[PDB]
Design a binder for this molecule. Structure first.
Ligand code: FES
Length: 98
């Protein structure tokens, strides 16, 4: 199945919805759609690609960096997050990552 993922970031002037397969990570999907999101490790051990899930469910079980509390507030490491429903995500949340 494919899901619609809305990406938001005012500063970067981004507010677009993309359609991606459920086996595609949020970051890869954005990249193939011309949306350049930050990343470093691409392996789940850094804060570079962090986003915040505003609405919807995702799977980021391969992540390592974030803790339960962070995850609970909706933060997700986009390089290892797959959509489980249509969702809305704010990008570039690294500075806000407490
Ligand atoms: S780029 Fe490092 S965790 Fe995603």
């Amino acid at each position: 199945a494919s899901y619609q993922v809305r990406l938001i970031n005012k500063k970067q002037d981004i507010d677009t919805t993309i359609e991606i397969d459920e086996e595609t990570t949020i970051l890869d999907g954005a990249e193939e759609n011309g949306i350049e999101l930050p990343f470093s490790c691409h392996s789940g051990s850094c804060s570079s690609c962090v986003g915040k899930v505003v609405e919807g469910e995702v799977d980021q079980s391969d992540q390592i960096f974030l803790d339960d509390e962070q995850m609970g507030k909706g933060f997700a490491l986009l390089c290892v997050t797959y959509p489980r429903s249509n969702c809305t995500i704010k990008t570039h949340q690294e500075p806000y990552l407490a």
